[PDB]
Coordinates of C-alpha atoms and ligand atoms in Angstrom, one line a residue:
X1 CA 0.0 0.0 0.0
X2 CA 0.9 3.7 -0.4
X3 CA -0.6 6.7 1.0
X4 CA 0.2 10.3 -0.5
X5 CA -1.3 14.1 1.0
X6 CA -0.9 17.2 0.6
X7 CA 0.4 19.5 3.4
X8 CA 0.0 23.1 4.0
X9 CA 1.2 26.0 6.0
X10 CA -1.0 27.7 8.7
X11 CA -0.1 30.8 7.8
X12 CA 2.1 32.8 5.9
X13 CA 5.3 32.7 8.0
X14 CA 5.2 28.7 7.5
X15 CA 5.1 28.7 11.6
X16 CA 3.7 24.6 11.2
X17 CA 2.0 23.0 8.2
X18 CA -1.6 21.3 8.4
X19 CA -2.3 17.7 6.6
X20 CA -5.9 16.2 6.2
X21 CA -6.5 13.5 8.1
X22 CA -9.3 10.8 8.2
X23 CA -10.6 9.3 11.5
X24 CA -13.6 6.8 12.2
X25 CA -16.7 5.3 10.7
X26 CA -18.3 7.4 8.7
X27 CA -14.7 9.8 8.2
X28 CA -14.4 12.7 10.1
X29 CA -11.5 14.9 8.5
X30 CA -9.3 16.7 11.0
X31 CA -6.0 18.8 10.3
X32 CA -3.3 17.4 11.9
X33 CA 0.3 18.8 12.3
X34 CA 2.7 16.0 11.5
X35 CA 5.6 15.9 13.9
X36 CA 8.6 13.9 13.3
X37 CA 9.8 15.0 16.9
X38 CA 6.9 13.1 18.8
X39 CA 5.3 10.1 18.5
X40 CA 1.5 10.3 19.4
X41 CA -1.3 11.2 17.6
X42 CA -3.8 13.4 19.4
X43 CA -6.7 15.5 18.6
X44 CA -9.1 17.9 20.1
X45 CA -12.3 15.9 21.2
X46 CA -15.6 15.5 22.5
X47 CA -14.2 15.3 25.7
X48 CA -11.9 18.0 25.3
X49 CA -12.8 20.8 28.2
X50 CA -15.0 23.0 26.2
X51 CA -12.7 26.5 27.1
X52 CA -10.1 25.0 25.8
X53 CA -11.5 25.0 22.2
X54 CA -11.6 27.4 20.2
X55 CA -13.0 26.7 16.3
X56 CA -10.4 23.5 16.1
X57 CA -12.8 21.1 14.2
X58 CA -13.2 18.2 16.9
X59 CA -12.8 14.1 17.0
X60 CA -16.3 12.8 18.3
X61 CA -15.7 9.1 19.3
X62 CA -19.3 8.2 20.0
X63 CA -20.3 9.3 16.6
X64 CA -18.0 6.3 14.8
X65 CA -18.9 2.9 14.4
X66 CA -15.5 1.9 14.9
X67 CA -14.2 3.4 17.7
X68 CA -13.6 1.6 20.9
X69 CA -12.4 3.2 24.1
X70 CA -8.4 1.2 25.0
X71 CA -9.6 1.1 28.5
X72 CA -7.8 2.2 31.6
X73 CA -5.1 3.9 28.7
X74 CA -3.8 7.6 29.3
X75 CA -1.4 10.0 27.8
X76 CA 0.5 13.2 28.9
X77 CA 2.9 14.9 27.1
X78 CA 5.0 17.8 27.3
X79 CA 6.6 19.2 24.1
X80 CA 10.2 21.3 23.3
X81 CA 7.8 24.4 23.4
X82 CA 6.5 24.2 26.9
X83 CA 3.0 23.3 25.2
X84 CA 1.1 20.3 26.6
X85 CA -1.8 18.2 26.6
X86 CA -3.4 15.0 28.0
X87 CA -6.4 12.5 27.9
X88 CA -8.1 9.4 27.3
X89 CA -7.5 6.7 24.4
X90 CA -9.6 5.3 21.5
X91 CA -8.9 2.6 18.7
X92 CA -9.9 3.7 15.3
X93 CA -9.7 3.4 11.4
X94 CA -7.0 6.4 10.6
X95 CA -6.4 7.0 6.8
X96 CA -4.2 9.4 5.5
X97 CA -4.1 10.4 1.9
X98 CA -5.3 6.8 1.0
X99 CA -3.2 4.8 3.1
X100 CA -5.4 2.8 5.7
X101 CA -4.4 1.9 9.2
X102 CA -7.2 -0.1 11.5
X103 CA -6.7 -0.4 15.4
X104 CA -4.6 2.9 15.7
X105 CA -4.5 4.5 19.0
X106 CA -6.1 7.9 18.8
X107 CA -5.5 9.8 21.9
X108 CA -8.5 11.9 22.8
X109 CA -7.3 15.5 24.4
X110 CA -9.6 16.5 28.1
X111 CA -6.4 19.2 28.1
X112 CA -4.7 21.1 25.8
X113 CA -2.6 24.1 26.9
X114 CA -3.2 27.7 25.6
X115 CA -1.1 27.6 22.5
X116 CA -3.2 25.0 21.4
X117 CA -6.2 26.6 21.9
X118 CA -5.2 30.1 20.3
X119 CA -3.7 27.8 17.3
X120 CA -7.5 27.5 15.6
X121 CA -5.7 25.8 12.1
X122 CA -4.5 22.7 14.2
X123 CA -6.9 19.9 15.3
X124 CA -3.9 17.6 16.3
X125 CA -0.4 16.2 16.3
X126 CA 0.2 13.1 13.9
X127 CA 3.6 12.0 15.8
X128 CA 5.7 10.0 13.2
X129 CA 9.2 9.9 15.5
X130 CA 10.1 6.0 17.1
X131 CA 7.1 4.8 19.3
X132 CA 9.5 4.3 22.5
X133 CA 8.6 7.8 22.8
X134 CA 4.8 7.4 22.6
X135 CA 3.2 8.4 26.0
X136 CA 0.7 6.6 26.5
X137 CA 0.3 4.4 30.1
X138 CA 0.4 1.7 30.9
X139 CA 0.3 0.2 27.2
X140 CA 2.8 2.1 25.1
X141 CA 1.4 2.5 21.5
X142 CA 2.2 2.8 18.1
X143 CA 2.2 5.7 15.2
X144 CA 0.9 5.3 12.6
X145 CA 3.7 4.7 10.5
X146 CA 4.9 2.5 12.6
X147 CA 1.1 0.7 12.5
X148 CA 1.6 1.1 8.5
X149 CA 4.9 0.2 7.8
X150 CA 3.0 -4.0 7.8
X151 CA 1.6 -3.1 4.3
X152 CA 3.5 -0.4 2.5
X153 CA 5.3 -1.2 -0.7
X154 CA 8.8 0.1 0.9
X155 CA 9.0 1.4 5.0
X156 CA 9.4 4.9 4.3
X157 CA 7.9 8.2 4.3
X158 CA 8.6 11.7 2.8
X159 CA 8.1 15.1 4.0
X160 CA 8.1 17.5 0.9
X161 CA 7.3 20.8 2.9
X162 CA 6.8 24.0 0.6
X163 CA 8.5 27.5 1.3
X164 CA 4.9 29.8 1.2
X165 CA 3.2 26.7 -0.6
X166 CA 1.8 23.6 0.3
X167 CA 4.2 20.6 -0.2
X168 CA 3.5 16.7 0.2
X169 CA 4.1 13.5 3.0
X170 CA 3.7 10.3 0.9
X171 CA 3.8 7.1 2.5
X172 CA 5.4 3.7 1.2
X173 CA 7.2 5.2 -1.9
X174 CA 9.7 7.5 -3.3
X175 CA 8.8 9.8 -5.6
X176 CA 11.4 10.1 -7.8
X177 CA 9.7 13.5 -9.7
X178 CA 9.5 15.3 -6.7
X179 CA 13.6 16.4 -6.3
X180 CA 16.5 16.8 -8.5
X181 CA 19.8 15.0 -8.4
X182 CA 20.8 11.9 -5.8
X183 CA 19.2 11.4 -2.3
X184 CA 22.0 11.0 0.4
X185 CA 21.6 8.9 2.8
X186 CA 22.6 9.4 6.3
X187 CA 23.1 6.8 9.5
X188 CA 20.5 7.5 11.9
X189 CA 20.4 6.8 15.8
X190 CA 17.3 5.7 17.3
X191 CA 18.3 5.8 20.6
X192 CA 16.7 9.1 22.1
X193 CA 13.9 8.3 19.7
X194 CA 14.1 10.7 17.6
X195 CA 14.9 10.5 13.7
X196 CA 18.7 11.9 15.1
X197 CA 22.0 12.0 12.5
X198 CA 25.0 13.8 12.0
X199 CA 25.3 16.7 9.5
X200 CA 29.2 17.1 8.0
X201 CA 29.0 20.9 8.6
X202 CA 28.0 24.0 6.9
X203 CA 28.2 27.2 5.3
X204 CA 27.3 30.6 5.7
X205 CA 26.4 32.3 2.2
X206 CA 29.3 32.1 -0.2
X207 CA 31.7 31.8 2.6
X208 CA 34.0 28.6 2.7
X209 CA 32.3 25.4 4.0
X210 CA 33.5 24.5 8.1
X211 CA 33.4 20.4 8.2
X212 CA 32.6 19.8 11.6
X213 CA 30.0 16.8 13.0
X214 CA 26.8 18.1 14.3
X215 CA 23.8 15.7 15.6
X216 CA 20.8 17.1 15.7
X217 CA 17.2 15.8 14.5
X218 CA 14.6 15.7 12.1
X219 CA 12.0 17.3 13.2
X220 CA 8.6 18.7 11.2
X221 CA 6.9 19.4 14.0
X222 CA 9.8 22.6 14.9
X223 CA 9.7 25.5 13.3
X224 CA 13.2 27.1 13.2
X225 CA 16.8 25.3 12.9
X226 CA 18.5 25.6 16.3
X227 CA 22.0 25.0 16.1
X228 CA 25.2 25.4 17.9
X229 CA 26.0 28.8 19.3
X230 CA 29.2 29.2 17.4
X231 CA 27.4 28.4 14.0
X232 CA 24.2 30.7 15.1
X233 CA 27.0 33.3 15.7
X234 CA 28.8 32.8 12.6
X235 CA 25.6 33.0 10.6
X236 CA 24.3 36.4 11.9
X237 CA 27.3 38.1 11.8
X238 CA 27.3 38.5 8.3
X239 CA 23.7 40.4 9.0
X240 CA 24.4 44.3 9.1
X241 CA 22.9 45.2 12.6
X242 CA 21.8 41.6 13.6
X243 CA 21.8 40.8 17.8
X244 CA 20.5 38.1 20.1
X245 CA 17.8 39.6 22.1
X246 CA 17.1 38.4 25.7
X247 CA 13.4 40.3 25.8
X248 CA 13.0 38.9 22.1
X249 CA 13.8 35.3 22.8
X250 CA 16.4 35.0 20.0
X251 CA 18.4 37.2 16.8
X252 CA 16.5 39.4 15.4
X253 CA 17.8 41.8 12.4
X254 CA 17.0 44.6 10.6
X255 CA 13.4 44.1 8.2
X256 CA 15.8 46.0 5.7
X257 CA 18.5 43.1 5.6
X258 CA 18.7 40.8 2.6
X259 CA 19.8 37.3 4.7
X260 CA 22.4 34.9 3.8
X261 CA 21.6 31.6 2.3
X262 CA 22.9 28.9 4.9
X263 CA 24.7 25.3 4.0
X264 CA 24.0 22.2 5.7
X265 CA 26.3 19.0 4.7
X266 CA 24.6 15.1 4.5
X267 CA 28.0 13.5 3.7
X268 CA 29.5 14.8 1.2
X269 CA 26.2 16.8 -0.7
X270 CA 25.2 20.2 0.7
X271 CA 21.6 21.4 1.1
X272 CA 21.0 25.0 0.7
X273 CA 18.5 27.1 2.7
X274 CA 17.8 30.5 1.1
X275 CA 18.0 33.7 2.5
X276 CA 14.3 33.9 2.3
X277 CA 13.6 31.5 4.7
X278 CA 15.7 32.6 7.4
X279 CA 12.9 35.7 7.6
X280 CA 10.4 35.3 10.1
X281 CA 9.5 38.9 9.5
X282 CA 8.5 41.6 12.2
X283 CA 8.8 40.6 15.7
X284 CA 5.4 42.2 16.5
X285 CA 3.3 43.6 14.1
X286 CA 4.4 47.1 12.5
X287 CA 8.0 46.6 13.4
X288 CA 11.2 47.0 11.4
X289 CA 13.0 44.0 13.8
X290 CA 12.7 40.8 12.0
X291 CA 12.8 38.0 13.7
X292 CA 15.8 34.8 12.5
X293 CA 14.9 31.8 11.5
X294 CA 18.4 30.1 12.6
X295 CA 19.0 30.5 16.3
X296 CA 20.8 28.9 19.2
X297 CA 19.9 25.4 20.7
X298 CA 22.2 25.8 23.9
X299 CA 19.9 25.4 26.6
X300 CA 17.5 23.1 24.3
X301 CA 19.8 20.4 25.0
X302 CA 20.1 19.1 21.2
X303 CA 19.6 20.7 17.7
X304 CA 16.6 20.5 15.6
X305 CA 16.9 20.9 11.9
X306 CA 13.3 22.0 11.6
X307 CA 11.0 23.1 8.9
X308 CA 13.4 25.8 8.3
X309 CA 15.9 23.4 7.0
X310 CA 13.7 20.6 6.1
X311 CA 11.5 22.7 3.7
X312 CA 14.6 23.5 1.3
X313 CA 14.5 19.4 1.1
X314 CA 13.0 16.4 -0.3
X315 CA 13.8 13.9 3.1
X316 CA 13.4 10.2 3.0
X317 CA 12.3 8.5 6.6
X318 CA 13.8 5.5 6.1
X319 CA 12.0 2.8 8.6
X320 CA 13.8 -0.4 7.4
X321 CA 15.6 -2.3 10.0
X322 CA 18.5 -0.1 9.8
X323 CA 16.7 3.6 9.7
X324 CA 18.6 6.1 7.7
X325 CA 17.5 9.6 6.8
X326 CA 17.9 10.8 3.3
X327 CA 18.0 14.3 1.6
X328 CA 18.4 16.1 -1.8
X329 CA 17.8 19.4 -3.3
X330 CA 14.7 20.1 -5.6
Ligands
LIG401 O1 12.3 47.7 16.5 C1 11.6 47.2 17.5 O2 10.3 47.2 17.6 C2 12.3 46.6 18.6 C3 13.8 46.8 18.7 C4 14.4 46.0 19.8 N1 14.8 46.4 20.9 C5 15.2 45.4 21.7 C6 15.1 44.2 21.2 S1 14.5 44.3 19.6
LIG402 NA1 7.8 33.3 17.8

């Protein structure tokens, strides 16, 4: 089996990207923020605590024929953000973009934390990291690629995000149209879960590329790329007027600057971000300080190579045995 959808940003910064998602007996369609950094897929709910909603579209359990409640289960979980929520747990028919799993776990939110709430584009997180980290207790469960992997034609999945445009997660194949050159592959470690590898080093516009290891993850479900402080350093200080902000939370720049394009090595190939999506624009509305799209993971306690990076990809999940991670321009 294969399974292909379309995915689209939220908004027009490209803060997260929304993909359609099927749930239950007859289908109820929810919009689900796929997160390669988590591993549990949650939605808003009947159950969920009615101030806590506000015009998410909601899972109704009791309205499918084939949900069942996965008694005595619970789940809790805490993300990189401070966000949070927590509930109850159903089994149910999930399809996504064709691709049919039966007997997933669909964990049913009583509480979500306020940026949830205020987030009205996002019903839910689709978690597609390892399921070691899956919260839910005392039965651990699985995603649903995990779930899926029993039936695709090959254990993969894609993330094809867009920059200002919708892009594409297809499940079970590679689609060889969708990027340009070779994919290379990269060793991944599964041991903190996460879909976590090594890039070779980087480069900061036209400058001279530094090889030096850096692990960090994969991660759709993060906005920014957070990276080492000497990088983050290096990158801004080829901005004209660029600082780190403590009352900001991060670099900000002049709205005047035009940004740098920034290299990330996968072996030996090199994966360029443009300028352009470094710019998270105006750090509150009406402003001439920009906000930066690269800033420092010290204090996160690893390095993300979120949608920032991710979008300038095509990026094989590789689920065989051995999991890899593969990239190429496109
Ligand atoms: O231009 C603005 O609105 C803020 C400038 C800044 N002052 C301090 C941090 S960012
Ligand atoms: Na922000």
């Amino acid at each position: 089996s294969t399974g292909s959808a379309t995915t689209t940003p939220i908004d027009s910064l490209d803060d997260a990207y929304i993909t359609p998602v099927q749930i239950g007996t007859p289908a109820q369609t929810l919009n689900l923020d796929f997160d390669t950094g988590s591993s549990d897929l949650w939605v808003f709910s009947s159950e969920t605590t009615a101030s806590e909603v506000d015009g998410q579209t909601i899972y109704t359990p009791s309205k499918s024929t084939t949900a069942k409640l996965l008694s005595g289960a619970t789940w809790s979980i805490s993300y990189g953000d401070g966000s949070s929520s927590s509930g109850d747990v159903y089994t149910d028919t999930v399809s996504v973009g064709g691709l049919t799993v039966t007997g997933q776990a669909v964990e049913s939110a009583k509480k979500v934390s306020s940026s949830f709430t205020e987030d009205s584009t996002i019903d839910g997180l689709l978690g597609l990291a390892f399921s070691t980290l899956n919260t839910v207790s005392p039965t651990q469960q699985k995603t649903f690629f995990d779930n899926a992997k029993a039936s695709l034609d090959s254990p993969v999945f894609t993330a094809d995000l867009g920059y200002h445009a919708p892009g594409t997660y297809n499940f079970g194949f590679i689609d060889t149209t969708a990027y340009t050159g070779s994919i290379t592959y990269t060793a991944v470690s599964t041991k903190q879960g996460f879909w976590e590898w090594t890039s070779t080093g980087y480069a900061v516009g036209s400058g001279t590329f530094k090889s030096t290891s850096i692990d960090g993850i994969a991660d759709t479900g993060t906005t920014l790329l957070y990276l080492p402080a000497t990088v983050v350093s290096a990158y801004w200080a080829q901005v004209s007027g660029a600082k780190s902000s403590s009352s900001v939370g991060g670099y900000v720049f002049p709205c005047s600057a035009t940004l740098p394009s920034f290299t990330f090595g996968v072996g030996s190939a090199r994966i360029v971000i443009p300028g352009d999506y470094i710019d998270f624009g105006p750090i509150s509305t009406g402003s001439s300080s920009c906000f930066g799209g690269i800033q420092s993971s010290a204090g996160i306690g690893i390095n993300i190579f979120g949608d920032v990076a991710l979008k300038a990809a095509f990026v094989v999940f590789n689920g065989a045995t051995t999991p890899t991670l593969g990239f190429a321009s496109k």
